[PDB]
Structures are given as structure tokens and as C-alpha cells.
Tab-separated table of C-alpha atoms and ligand atoms in Angstrom:
chain	number	residue	atom	x	y	z
Z	1	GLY	CA	-0.092	-0.390	0.121
Z	2	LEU	CA	2.634	2.582	1.191
Z	3	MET	CA	4.780	1.049	-2.038
Z	4	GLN	CA	5.863	3.899	-4.708
Z	5	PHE	CA	7.181	3.267	-7.699
Z	6	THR	CA	9.992	5.724	-8.582
Z	7	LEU	CA	12.004	6.581	-11.562
Z	8	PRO	CA	15.442	7.747	-12.010
Z	9	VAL	CA	15.885	11.382	-11.456
Z	10	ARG	CA	15.856	12.292	-15.657
Z	11	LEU	CA	13.318	10.121	-16.148
Z	12	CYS	CA	10.724	11.394	-13.146
Z	13	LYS	CA	11.444	14.683	-14.610
Z	14	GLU	CA	11.144	14.030	-18.627
Z	15	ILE	CA	7.994	11.620	-17.813
Z	16	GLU	CA	5.835	14.947	-17.413
Z	17	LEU	CA	6.656	16.030	-20.955
Z	18	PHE	CA	4.686	15.549	-24.032
Z	19	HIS	CA	7.878	14.482	-26.051
Z	20	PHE	CA	9.012	11.605	-23.642
Z	21	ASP	CA	10.616	8.922	-25.322
Z	22	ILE	CA	10.390	5.635	-22.812
Z	23	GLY	CA	13.823	4.323	-24.016
Z	24	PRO	CA	14.778	0.687	-25.509
Z	25	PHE	CA	14.922	-0.951	-21.984
Z	26	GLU	CA	11.359	-3.376	-22.300
Z	27	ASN	CA	11.694	-4.144	-19.024
Z	28	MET	CA	11.512	-0.944	-17.716
Z	29	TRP	CA	7.872	0.121	-19.574
Z	30	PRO	CA	5.518	-1.901	-16.826
Z	31	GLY	CA	6.855	0.356	-14.017
Z	32	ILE	CA	6.857	3.568	-16.147
Z	33	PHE	CA	2.778	2.335	-16.793
Z	34	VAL	CA	2.548	2.134	-13.034
Z	35	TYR	CA	4.027	5.123	-11.948
Z	36	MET	CA	1.803	7.035	-14.516
Z	37	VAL	CA	-1.454	5.270	-13.268
Z	38	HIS	CA	-0.033	6.055	-9.330
Z	39	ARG	CA	0.258	9.933	-10.349
Z	40	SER	CA	-2.746	10.361	-12.765
Z	41	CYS	CA	-5.273	8.017	-11.183
Z	42	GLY	CA	-4.008	7.290	-7.310
Z	43	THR	CA	-1.625	4.292	-5.620
Z	44	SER	CA	-5.269	3.308	-4.461
Z	45	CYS	CA	-7.258	3.013	-8.183
Z	46	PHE	CA	-5.918	-0.395	-8.647
Z	47	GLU	CA	-4.838	-3.509	-6.552
Z	48	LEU	CA	-0.837	-3.707	-7.318
Z	49	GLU	CA	-1.008	-7.051	-7.546
Z	50	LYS	CA	-3.728	-7.684	-10.044
Z	51	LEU	CA	-2.523	-4.441	-12.200
Z	52	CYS	CA	0.590	-6.419	-12.649
Z	53	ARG	CA	-0.864	-9.237	-13.796
Z	54	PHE	CA	-3.132	-7.304	-16.239
Z	55	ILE	CA	-0.014	-5.709	-17.624
Z	56	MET	CA	1.869	-8.593	-18.215
Z	57	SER	CA	-0.910	-10.670	-19.757
Z	58	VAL	CA	-1.784	-7.306	-21.954
Z	59	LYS	CA	1.967	-7.544	-22.898
Z	60	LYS	CA	1.901	-11.194	-23.778
Z	61	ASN	CA	-0.702	-10.652	-26.208
Z	62	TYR	CA	1.334	-8.069	-28.212
Z	63	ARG	CA	2.941	-9.086	-31.368
Z	64	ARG	CA	6.608	-8.808	-32.696
Z	65	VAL	CA	5.801	-6.539	-35.429
Z	66	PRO	CA	7.755	-3.600	-36.242
Z	67	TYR	CA	5.508	-0.461	-35.232
Z	68	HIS	CA	2.201	-1.973	-33.847
Z	69	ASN	CA	4.045	-3.440	-30.557
Z	70	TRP	CA	4.399	-3.430	-26.846
Z	71	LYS	CA	6.496	-0.112	-27.274
Z	72	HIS	CA	3.491	1.534	-29.363
Z	73	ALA	CA	0.879	0.886	-26.364
Z	74	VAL	CA	3.436	2.331	-23.804
Z	75	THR	CA	4.242	5.437	-25.697
Z	76	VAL	CA	0.510	5.971	-26.519
Z	77	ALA	CA	-0.643	5.753	-22.911
Z	78	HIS	CA	2.422	7.864	-21.719
Z	79	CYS	CA	0.908	10.651	-24.255
Z	80	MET	CA	-2.331	10.234	-22.764
Z	81	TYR	CA	-0.663	10.517	-19.126
Z	82	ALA	CA	0.641	13.871	-20.397
Z	83	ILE	CA	-2.551	14.899	-21.681
Z	84	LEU	CA	-4.390	13.996	-18.126
Z	85	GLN	CA	-1.716	15.795	-15.980
Z	86	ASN	CA	-1.654	18.979	-17.998
Z	87	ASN	CA	-5.918	19.064	-17.573
Z	88	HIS	CA	-6.223	18.078	-14.143
Z	89	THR	CA	-9.771	19.537	-13.106
Z	90	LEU	CA	-11.303	18.363	-16.599
Z	91	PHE	CA	-11.643	14.418	-16.177
Z	92	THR	CA	-13.696	12.485	-13.734
Z	93	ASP	CA	-11.966	9.377	-11.770
Z	94	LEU	CA	-13.882	7.132	-13.969
Z	95	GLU	CA	-12.046	8.368	-17.332
Z	96	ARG	CA	-8.514	8.603	-15.739
Z	97	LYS	CA	-8.922	5.070	-14.782
Z	98	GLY	CA	-10.437	3.634	-18.065
Z	99	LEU	CA	-8.297	5.702	-20.560
Z	100	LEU	CA	-4.623	4.646	-19.262
Z	101	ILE	CA	-6.184	1.122	-19.919
Z	102	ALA	CA	-7.491	2.302	-23.008
Z	103	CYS	CA	-4.526	3.409	-24.399
Z	104	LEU	CA	-2.298	0.326	-23.076
Z	105	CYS	CA	-4.958	-2.079	-25.207
Z	106	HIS	CA	-6.057	-0.142	-27.960
Z	107	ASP	CA	-3.798	-2.445	-30.787
Z	108	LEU	CA	-3.747	-5.307	-28.430
Z	109	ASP	CA	-3.303	-8.712	-30.890
Z	110	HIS	CA	-2.290	-6.289	-33.916
Z	111	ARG	CA	-0.958	-8.667	-37.182
Z	112	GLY	CA	0.878	-5.447	-38.365
Z	113	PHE	CA	-2.042	-5.476	-41.423
Z	114	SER	CA	-4.353	-2.264	-42.293
Z	115	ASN	CA	-8.361	-3.096	-42.025
Z	116	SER	CA	-8.014	-3.022	-46.151
Z	117	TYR	CA	-5.861	-5.884	-46.267
Z	118	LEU	CA	-8.029	-8.219	-43.655
Z	119	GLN	CA	-11.357	-7.261	-46.454
Z	120	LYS	CA	-8.873	-8.064	-49.196
Z	121	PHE	CA	-7.853	-11.126	-47.654
Z	122	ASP	CA	-11.218	-12.155	-46.686
Z	123	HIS	CA	-9.341	-12.694	-43.421
Z	124	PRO	CA	-12.382	-14.393	-40.704
Z	125	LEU	CA	-12.133	-11.143	-38.199
Z	126	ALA	CA	-13.383	-9.144	-41.681
Z	127	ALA	CA	-16.683	-11.519	-41.685
Z	128	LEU	CA	-17.161	-11.088	-37.486
Z	129	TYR	CA	-16.778	-7.432	-38.033
Z	130	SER	CA	-17.588	-5.376	-41.384
Z	131	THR	CA	-16.378	-1.873	-39.871
Z	132	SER	CA	-13.275	-0.896	-37.691
Z	133	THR	CA	-11.788	-4.599	-37.987
Z	134	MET	CA	-9.192	-4.657	-35.835
Z	135	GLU	CA	-10.472	-1.685	-33.376
Z	136	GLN	CA	-13.093	-4.173	-32.641
Z	137	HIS	CA	-10.962	-6.895	-31.864
Z	138	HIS	CA	-8.699	-4.687	-29.726
Z	139	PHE	CA	-11.447	-3.845	-27.426
Z	140	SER	CA	-12.756	-8.010	-27.907
Z	141	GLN	CA	-9.023	-8.726	-26.790
Z	142	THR	CA	-9.369	-6.245	-23.716
Z	143	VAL	CA	-12.448	-7.836	-22.268
Z	144	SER	CA	-10.951	-11.718	-22.919
Z	145	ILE	CA	-7.774	-10.279	-20.667
Z	146	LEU	CA	-10.286	-8.591	-17.958
Z	147	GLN	CA	-12.098	-12.040	-17.212
Z	148	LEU	CA	-8.998	-14.247	-16.626
Z	149	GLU	CA	-8.993	-15.165	-13.113
Z	150	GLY	CA	-6.948	-12.531	-11.039
Z	151	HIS	CA	-6.904	-9.929	-13.931
Z	152	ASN	CA	-10.151	-8.144	-13.139
Z	153	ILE	CA	-8.467	-4.600	-12.054
Z	154	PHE	CA	-12.271	-2.857	-12.105
Z	155	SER	CA	-13.344	-5.415	-9.496
Z	156	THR	CA	-13.826	-2.684	-6.763
Z	157	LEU	CA	-16.217	-0.428	-8.855
Z	158	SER	CA	-19.454	-0.370	-8.555
Z	159	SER	CA	-21.987	-2.414	-11.132
Z	160	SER	CA	-22.714	0.914	-12.891
Z	161	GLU	CA	-18.994	2.470	-12.902
Z	162	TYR	CA	-17.763	-1.252	-14.180
Z	163	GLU	CA	-20.409	-0.667	-17.376
Z	164	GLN	CA	-19.455	2.864	-17.948
Z	165	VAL	CA	-15.575	2.752	-17.610
Z	166	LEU	CA	-15.638	-0.381	-20.071
Z	167	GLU	CA	-18.150	1.901	-22.371
Z	168	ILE	CA	-15.254	4.444	-22.243
Z	169	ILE	CA	-12.677	2.034	-23.069
Z	170	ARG	CA	-14.873	0.615	-25.677
Z	171	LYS	CA	-15.272	4.134	-27.704
Z	172	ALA	CA	-11.825	5.218	-26.704
Z	173	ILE	CA	-10.591	2.196	-28.793
Z	174	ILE	CA	-13.033	2.061	-31.854
Z	175	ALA	CA	-11.767	5.936	-32.312
Z	176	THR	CA	-8.386	4.957	-32.863
Z	177	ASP	CA	-9.504	3.980	-36.349
Z	178	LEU	CA	-8.168	6.634	-38.458
Z	179	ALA	CA	-11.140	6.142	-40.723
Z	180	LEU	CA	-13.680	7.602	-38.343
Z	181	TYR	CA	-11.222	10.884	-37.103
Z	182	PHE	CA	-12.139	12.812	-40.497
Z	183	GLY	CA	-15.573	13.347	-39.518
Z	184	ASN	CA	-15.161	13.402	-35.507
Z	185	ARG	CA	-12.561	16.689	-35.994
Z	186	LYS	CA	-14.989	18.318	-38.568
Z	187	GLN	CA	-17.985	18.076	-36.065
Z	188	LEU	CA	-15.602	19.232	-32.969
Z	189	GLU	CA	-14.391	21.913	-35.428
Z	190	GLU	CA	-17.858	23.046	-36.090
Z	191	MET	CA	-18.839	22.628	-32.632
Z	192	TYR	CA	-16.348	24.866	-31.064
Z	193	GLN	CA	-16.897	27.587	-33.732
Z	194	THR	CA	-20.320	27.929	-33.797
Z	195	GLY	CA	-20.029	27.810	-29.679
Z	196	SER	CA	-22.351	24.742	-29.010
Z	197	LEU	CA	-19.381	22.565	-27.369
Z	198	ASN	CA	-20.192	21.609	-24.275
Z	199	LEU	CA	-18.116	19.133	-21.968
Z	200	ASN	CA	-21.496	18.288	-19.805
Z	201	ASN	CA	-23.086	16.846	-22.752
Z	202	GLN	CA	-21.794	13.147	-22.583
Z	203	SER	CA	-21.735	12.781	-26.851
Z	204	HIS	CA	-19.739	15.992	-26.298
Z	205	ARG	CA	-17.120	14.453	-24.235
Z	206	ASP	CA	-17.161	10.973	-26.322
Z	207	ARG	CA	-15.995	13.244	-29.355
Z	208	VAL	CA	-13.220	15.096	-27.007
Z	209	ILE	CA	-11.935	11.632	-25.969
Z	210	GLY	CA	-12.142	10.511	-29.588
Z	211	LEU	CA	-9.962	13.274	-30.768
Z	212	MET	CA	-7.514	12.704	-27.509
Z	213	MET	CA	-7.106	8.908	-28.738
Z	214	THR	CA	-6.181	10.004	-32.385
Z	215	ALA	CA	-3.317	12.430	-30.862
Z	216	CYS	CA	-1.856	9.890	-28.563
Z	217	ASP	CA	-2.096	7.217	-31.561
Z	218	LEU	CA	-0.212	9.659	-33.810
Z	219	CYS	CA	1.808	10.994	-30.854
Z	220	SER	CA	5.281	9.939	-33.195
Z	221	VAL	CA	4.975	13.133	-34.928
Z	222	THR	CA	5.093	15.370	-31.668
Z	223	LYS	CA	8.550	13.763	-30.601
Z	224	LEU	CA	12.178	15.222	-31.167
Z	225	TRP	CA	12.718	14.571	-34.683
Z	226	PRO	CA	15.492	11.627	-34.155
Z	227	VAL	CA	12.897	9.939	-32.475
Z	228	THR	CA	10.045	10.672	-35.130
Z	229	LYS	CA	12.379	9.908	-37.837
Z	230	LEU	CA	13.981	6.685	-36.466
Z	231	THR	CA	9.698	5.950	-35.213
Z	232	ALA	CA	8.971	6.375	-39.467
Z	233	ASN	CA	11.275	3.730	-40.209
Z	234	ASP	CA	9.245	1.003	-38.321
Z	235	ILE	CA	5.758	2.478	-39.444
Z	236	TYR	CA	7.060	1.870	-43.239
Z	237	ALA	CA	8.562	-1.605	-42.211
Z	238	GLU	CA	4.956	-2.974	-41.453
Z	239	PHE	CA	3.140	-0.836	-44.179
Z	240	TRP	CA	5.689	-1.981	-47.149
Z	241	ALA	CA	5.128	-5.930	-45.820
Z	242	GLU	CA	1.217	-5.242	-46.371
Z	243	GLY	CA	2.384	-3.938	-49.932
Z	244	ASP	CA	4.160	-6.921	-50.482
Z	245	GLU	CA	1.176	-8.963	-49.330
Z	246	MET	CA	-1.098	-6.898	-51.877
Z	247	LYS	CA	1.010	-7.887	-54.555
Z	248	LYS	CA	1.035	-11.266	-53.775
Z	249	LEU	CA	-3.112	-11.009	-54.017
Z	250	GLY	CA	-2.124	-9.480	-57.851
Z	251	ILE	CA	-3.747	-5.939	-56.326
Z	252	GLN	CA	-1.223	-2.762	-56.642
Z	253	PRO	CA	-1.052	-1.393	-53.327
Z	254	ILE	CA	-1.134	2.883	-52.508
Z	255	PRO	CA	2.030	4.151	-52.907
Z	256	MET	CA	2.280	4.906	-49.139
Z	257	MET	CA	2.957	0.906	-49.095
Z	258	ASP	CA	4.700	0.019	-51.913
Z	259	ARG	CA	8.508	-0.525	-51.394
Z	260	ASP	CA	9.217	1.013	-54.661
Z	261	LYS	CA	8.235	4.266	-54.174
Z	262	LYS	CA	10.265	5.076	-50.966
Z	263	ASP	CA	11.681	8.154	-52.814
Z	264	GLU	CA	7.932	9.759	-52.394
Z	265	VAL	CA	8.286	9.211	-48.582
Z	266	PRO	CA	9.182	12.960	-47.782
Z	267	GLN	CA	6.419	14.270	-49.908
Z	268	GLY	CA	3.897	11.503	-48.293
Z	269	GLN	CA	4.522	12.725	-44.835
Z	270	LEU	CA	3.967	16.378	-46.114
Z	271	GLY	CA	0.225	15.344	-47.162
Z	272	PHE	CA	0.115	13.571	-43.817
Z	273	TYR	CA	0.985	16.568	-41.709
Z	274	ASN	CA	-1.466	18.875	-43.477
Z	275	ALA	CA	-4.594	16.460	-43.785
Z	276	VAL	CA	-4.193	14.765	-40.706
Z	277	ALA	CA	-1.632	15.285	-37.959
Z	278	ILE	CA	-1.803	19.516	-37.899
Z	279	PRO	CA	-5.219	19.289	-37.938
Z	280	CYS	CA	-5.672	17.061	-35.377
Z	281	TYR	CA	-3.404	19.062	-32.391
Z	282	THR	CA	-5.160	22.357	-33.604
Z	283	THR	CA	-8.707	21.294	-32.872
Z	284	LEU	CA	-7.513	19.457	-29.627
Z	285	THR	CA	-5.245	22.745	-28.831
Z	286	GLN	CA	-8.419	24.485	-29.124
Z	287	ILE	CA	-10.509	22.539	-26.794
Z	288	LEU	CA	-7.684	21.785	-24.161
Z	289	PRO	CA	-4.837	24.680	-24.545
Z	290	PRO	CA	-2.554	22.999	-21.774
Z	291	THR	CA	-1.819	20.516	-25.074
Z	292	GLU	CA	-0.467	23.313	-27.389
Z	293	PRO	CA	3.023	21.649	-26.938
Z	294	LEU	CA	2.228	19.063	-29.131
Z	295	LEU	CA	0.948	20.998	-31.566
Z	296	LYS	CA	4.310	23.335	-31.287
Z	297	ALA	CA	6.462	19.850	-31.785
Z	298	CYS	CA	3.972	18.332	-34.774
Z	299	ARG	CA	4.912	21.958	-36.893
Z	300	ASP	CA	8.598	21.576	-35.770
Z	301	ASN	CA	8.725	18.004	-37.626
Z	302	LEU	CA	6.717	19.514	-40.193
Z	303	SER	CA	9.730	21.738	-41.013
Z	304	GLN	CA	12.145	18.696	-40.796
Z	305	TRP	CA	10.419	17.189	-43.609
Z	306	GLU	CA	10.264	20.014	-45.506
Z	307	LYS	CA	14.125	20.357	-45.101
Z	308	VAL	CA	14.350	16.334	-46.321
Z	309	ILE	CA	12.700	17.581	-49.356
Z	310	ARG	CA	14.887	20.699	-50.480
Z	311	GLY	CA	17.763	18.143	-50.107
Z	312	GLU	CA	19.165	19.866	-46.745
Z	313	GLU	CA	18.929	16.752	-45.149
D	1	JFW	C1	0.514	5.491	-38.184
D	1	JFW	O1	0.390	7.065	-39.011
D	1	JFW	C2	1.767	7.504	-39.465
D	1	JFW	C3	2.329	7.924	-38.834
D	1	JFW	C4	2.175	8.187	-37.563
D	1	JFW	C5	3.545	8.294	-39.564
D	1	JFW	N1	3.454	8.565	-41.126
D	1	JFW	C6	2.789	7.531	-41.807
D	1	JFW	C7	2.902	7.742	-43.474
D	1	JFW	S1	1.956	8.997	-43.998
D	1	JFW	C8	2.248	8.920	-45.441
D	1	JFW	N2	1.461	9.417	-46.599
D	1	JFW	C9	1.632	8.812	-47.942
D	1	JFW	C10	0.877	8.960	-49.186
D	1	JFW	C11	2.223	8.645	-50.485
D	1	JFW	C12	3.158	8.322	-50.059
D	1	JFW	N3	3.935	7.143	-51.322
D	1	JFW	C13	5.109	6.951	-50.656
D	1	JFW	S2	5.321	7.131	-48.789
D	1	JFW	C14	3.542	7.689	-48.663
D	1	JFW	C15	3.041	8.325	-47.579
D	1	JFW	N4	3.224	8.145	-46.531
D	1	JFW	C16	1.445	7.606	-40.848
D	1	JFW	C17	0.264	6.643	-41.359
D	2	MG	MG1	-4.670	0.575	-34.212
D	3	ZN	ZN1	-2.382	2.369	-32.264
């Protein structure tokens, strides 16, 4: 009960900054997550015995893929940690509990393949879940792990609070489907500008949490340039493998997934920052002003990709 996690001084300080990288020491990632749960939520939110057993079952159910791996899970949870800490009063106790767990679980059992590849392959999961195929799977895997003996970290919630938290997690994980992000941000953009946005309206909160989930999921673009650049190698390693598998089905992949079009990556990154990233962190910064450091970091990284094209790197 009086057992805190503590981190080395550099980590204790840098973990509070949006641009923190969790490092290459896999064995420290669980403690980093527990540390974030303790400061964000409380040392009492979860029985440490059950939390530790939950964390290790979730870790085991991530696969050895270049990008959608256990490192990504903890990275996305840290970005959520930094949002929640810079917005102390805006979130309920149930939301702070649910959203870190949601982030840890959001890509459970990812195979390194998009919803599109599953549908064109005719993968069984595409028959079970017609839209947001992998994301419904991710939530399914979350429920399964919560129902293992000794793994139910929510056991001390009332029946209504248990139902509310699972519904927060479900919406949070579904929202990480990028196909849904575009319309969600447009709606939030309209609501903010016409002044109709109301954080006591549950359907409005849901939308805001959706956008926080996209922001954390894409947080690779908000790190320092060398982290952003080296993460992009992992992202394209998965995409180019999918492109190879499209060619095996006799389908030309989109250029993003065709390794024969490596040369156009810098131009592709520009489209992506302008169409997805910058819009995401701009609407988020309008709704939650203390998340501005994410928008600033994203714009710095857009400038670095502009420099790559102009042959300065
Ligand atoms: C996971 O989201 C991402 C992150 C964080 C960073 N980068 C990307 C890739 S964006 C991207 N869009 C395009 C369009 C054409 C194209 N031709 C050759 S590479 C390439 C692209 N890369 C994604 C999808
Ligand atoms: Mg995902
Ligand atoms: Zn993800």
C-alpha cells in the first residue's frame, strides 16, 4: 500500500513532458506505466497485484511486429498521461482509470496489417466485424484479458461504474480507427466555432476523448526529430510488408505501402502532417489549451520534412 514506483531523476523529470521517449529498456516499460497510473489516478485506483498481472497479460498479447507492438502501447499511454496531467480538473476519476488502460490495450493482438488488407485477404475477422475490424478485435481482446482469473483490475467498481468504464474504453479504442477521425474532428471543429461545444454533454465528451485517442495514437509526430524519423522507419517497415502481401494477392498497393516508392516518403509525410496531424493537434489545442506543446512539436517536425525535400537532409 505504501509501495510507490520511483524513476531515475532524468526519467522522473522528462516523463511529465509531452515529447518523452520511453527508452530501449523493455523491462522498465511496466514500471513506467504503473508510475503513470499512480500519479494520474492514485496509488489506490488498482490492486497492485492485479494491475501487474493485467500489464503482463496485455504485454504477452502484443506481437513482434515492427510498429504495432508493446513499445507503441506504452508510448500511446504516456501521451495520454501527459494530456491528463496538464488538464487536472477536466476529467472524472472513471475517465482517468479507463483512458490509460484504453491506450495500453488499443492495438492488442495487432498483426501489422490494415483493415483494408484484412477485407481484400477475406480474413475471418473481416466477416465478424464489417467496420473498424482490428479496433473491435482490440476491444474484444481487452474484455477477454479482464475476465482471466486475478486480472479484473475494475473488481472494486460498483456495477454501474464497471459498465461506464468499459463503455469509455470501447469508444476510446473504436476512435483509434483513423477512418472515423476525419468526421469526428470536423464535427468538433463546427461545435467549437459556432460555440455549441459543451463538456457536460456526454456525446460531446465522447467526441473530445475520440480526438485525445487520435492525438496519443499519432504522437510519433510530436517527439524530437530523431525519434520521429526513426519511428517512421518502423511504420514504413509494416506498411511495405502489407504492400508486398497486396502484390501477392495481385493488387497494386497504394504508394504509401509500395516499397518501390521509398523516394516519395518525404512528400507523403507532408500530405499526412497537413491532412491529419496538424488539424488533429490544432482542434485538440483549441479544446484543451495546455496540449499546445503537441501542436508546436508537430509543426517543428513538418518543418524538418520540408528540409528533407529541399535536400538539406
Ligand atoms: C500511423 O500514422 C502515420 C504516422 C504516425 C506517420 N507516417 C505515416 C505515413 S503518411 C504517408 N502518406 C503517404 C502518401 C504517399 C506515399 N508514397 C510513398 S510514402 C507515402 C506516404 N506516407 C502514418 C500513416
Ligand atoms: Mg490501431
Ligand atoms: Zn495505435
